[PDB]
Amino acid sequence: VWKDADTTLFCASDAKAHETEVHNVWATHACVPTDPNPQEIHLENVTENFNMWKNNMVEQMQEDVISLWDQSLQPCVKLTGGSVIKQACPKISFDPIPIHYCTPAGYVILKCNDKNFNGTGPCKNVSSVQCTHGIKPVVSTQLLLNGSLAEEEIIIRSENLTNNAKTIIVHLNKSVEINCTRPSNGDIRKAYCEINGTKWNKVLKQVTEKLKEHFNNKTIIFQPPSGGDLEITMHSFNCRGEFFYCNTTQLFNNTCINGTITLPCKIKQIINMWQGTGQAMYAPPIDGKINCVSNITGILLTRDGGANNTSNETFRPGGGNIKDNWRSELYKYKVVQIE
Ligand SMILES: CC1(C)CC(NC(=O)C(=O)Nc2ccc(Br)cc2)CC(C)(C)N1
Ligand SMILES: *[C@@H]1O[C@H](CO)[C@@H](O)[C@H](O)[C@H]1NC(C)=O
Ligand SMILES: *[C@@H]1O[C@H](CO)[C@@H](O)[C@H](O)[C@H]1NC(C)=O
Ligand SMILES: *[C@@H]1O[C@H](CO)[C@@H](O)[C@H](O)[C@H]1NC(C)=O
Ligand SMILES: *[C@@H]1O[C@H](CO)[C@@H](O)[C@H](O)[C@H]1NC(C)=O
Ligand SMILES: *[C@@H]1O[C@H](CO)[C@@H](O)[C@H](O)[C@H]1NC(C)=O
Ligand SMILES: *[C@@H]1O[C@H](CO)[C@@H](O)[C@H](O)[C@H]1NC(C)=O
Ligand SMILES: *[C@@H]1O[C@H](CO)[C@@H](O)[C@H](O)[C@H]1NC(C)=O
Ligand SMILES: *[C@@H]1O[C@H](CO)[C@@H](O)[C@H](O)[C@H]1NC(C)=O
Ligand SMILES: *[C@@H]1O[C@H](CO)[C@@H](O)[C@H](O)[C@H]1NC(C)=O
Ligand SMILES: *[C@@H]1O[C@H](CO)[C@@H](O)[C@H](O)[C@H]1NC(C)=O
Ligand SMILES: *[C@@H]1O[C@H](CO)[C@@H](O)[C@H](O)[C@H]1NC(C)=O
């Protein structure tokens, strides 16, 4: 017998003690080795309720990633609360590694194995584990990168679809690669992302059809962000320590519903912190080819309000709350206390 409960989790990873890469360093001192032979118990015809939108596991992963960035990516100048903090800001080795989240004695993690599970409600196929799967703490907006894929159909996730103020997480069942490069050798900050147009438009059409099922077959329209900070209006992410801001206008235009899609990007030194603090400024980009090839595995969407009297629903890429990023991976888990 058990019950829903919150407790302090610990982490496990396969980090290398000899790596200077910041994630490896953090996990080496903050986590333990992973279990080579993990045990999993499938509960016989047990029904459990989940709520990915109210899961303390999310808050804890957030806290880990905040501390990791706080120790690994200190900017030259921090602007928060009115005070100005200056300090050294050397370039680092940066490449996210999988982090496992595990429960201590007296506790266990319940895992929903239901196909097409949306993250909330009852789960029929439930198993118990000590640790989650390996989750890379990838920080980004608009597009979710290097995450897990839905096993069956594309899944739409939201705490409340009817509430347009609540973020929508689209969980893809097929990866679309995004190839971002800052070429070696008139602007060290100019960059670009290449994406297979055929693959993207096909997936996006599948997402459209999926959104129809949730919005009474209303017409689904995609549009670029209306306004807001650059971190939100553009696809923001960190590649090799450098902050990339990419213009995704070409991705979200309800027209191509063929060739290569080249998104214009730029590396920014001055960033609005996702931690919520304030503003941070980093040193200029390192020289040479700066390249990151990522899997697009999900999308963060915000729905336009004031469309109730029309046959259209408008969706725009969003994000900014990194907790949603962790939710996209932790949705199927919950902690319970055993006796
Ligand atoms: C809640 C709300 C509206 C979200 C905002 N988000 C961000 O500034 C953000 O996500 N920035 C960011 C930075 C680097 C990378 Br790489 C990706 C994204 C920041 C705060 C202060 C928390 N307000
Ligand atoms: C329940 O989930 C487990 C783990 O994914 C899977 O092996 C099993 O086939 C599922 N059971 C059914 C009947 O769907
Ligand atoms: C998830 O599935 C449950 C099944 O009862 C349902 O109540 C809930 O509305 C679903 N959530 C979404 C966003 O589809
Ligand atoms: C992805 O999900 C959609 C439904 O959302 C489905 O039609 C399609 O077959 C899936 N693709 C793959 C490769 O499973
Ligand atoms: C979902 O959002 C709608 C629109 O804001 C609201 O009227 C409704 O109460 C919400 N549903 C729940 C279960 O809170
Ligand atoms: C990229 O996506 C493919 C599946 O489309 C997967 O096999 C591979 O592991 C992914 N790479 C990651 C997760 O970094
Ligand atoms: C990514 O794009 C760059 C520049 O076009 C290219 O050199 C590289 O081969 C690409 N990588 C992959 C895996 O497609
Ligand atoms: C969408 O249209 C199809 C085809 O007529 C219908 O079967 C289905 O019930 C509709 N779905 C919604 C959510 O309105
Ligand atoms: C993206 O590029 C388009 C032109 O292709 C431009 O109109 C738009 O302002 C850009 N978006 C942002 C957020 O800068
Ligand atoms: C969508 O693409 C078409 C291409 O002809 C363009 O004219 C239109 O302005 C685009 N809408 C946007 C970028 O919102
Ligand atoms: C995208 O993939 C398809 C095969 O799925 C291929 O035919 C097409 O050439 C690719 N497009 C690009 C831009 O490479
Ligand atoms: C995604 O994973 C690939 C393979 O490990 C990596 O090269 C790339 O830098 C990752 N993308 C991001 C945004 O971290």
Numbering used by the authors: 44 to 124, 198 to 301, 324 to 355, 357 to 396, 411 to 492
Sentences from the paper on this structure:
The HIV-1 viral spike is composed of three copies of the gp120 envelope glycoprotein attached non-covalently to three copies of the gp41 transmembrane molecule. Binding of the primary cell surface receptor, CD4, to the gp120 component of the viral spike exposes and/or induces the formation of a site for co-receptor binding (either CCR5 or CXCR4). The NBD chemotype consists of three essential regions: Region I, a para-substituted aromatic ring; Region II, an oxalamide linker; and Region III, a tetramethylpiperidine heterocyclic ring system.
Concurrent with this study, our endeavor to crystallize unliganded HIV-1 gp120 core led us to identify clade A/E93TH057 extended core (coree), which produced well diffracting crystals in the absence of sCD4 or CD4i antibodies. The clade A/E93TH057 gp120 coree, however, required mutation of His 375 to Ser (H375S) to co-crystalize with small molecules. Comparison of the NBD-557:clade BYU2 gp120 core V3s:48d complex with the NBD-557:clade A/E93TH057 gp120 coree complex demonstrated that the conformation of NBD-557 was nearly identical, with only a slight deviation of the tetramethylpiperidine gem-dimethyl groups. In the NBD-557:A/E93TH057 gp120 coree complex, residues Thr 257, Glu 370, Ser 375, and Ile 424 made contacts with the Region I para-brominated aromatic ring of NBD-557, while Trp 427 made an aromatic-aromatic π-stacking interaction with Region I. Along the neck of the Phe 43 cavity, the nitrogen atoms of the Region II oxalamide linker formed hydrogen bonds with backbone carbonyls of Asn 425 and Gly 473. Overall, the structures indicate that only the oxalamide linker of NBD-557 makes direct hydrogen bonds with gp120. Regarding Region III, which binds to the surface exposed vestibule of the Phe 43 cavity, the NBD-557:gp120 structures indicated that the amine of tetramethylpiperidine ring does not bind Asp 368 and that the contacts with gp120 were not optimal.
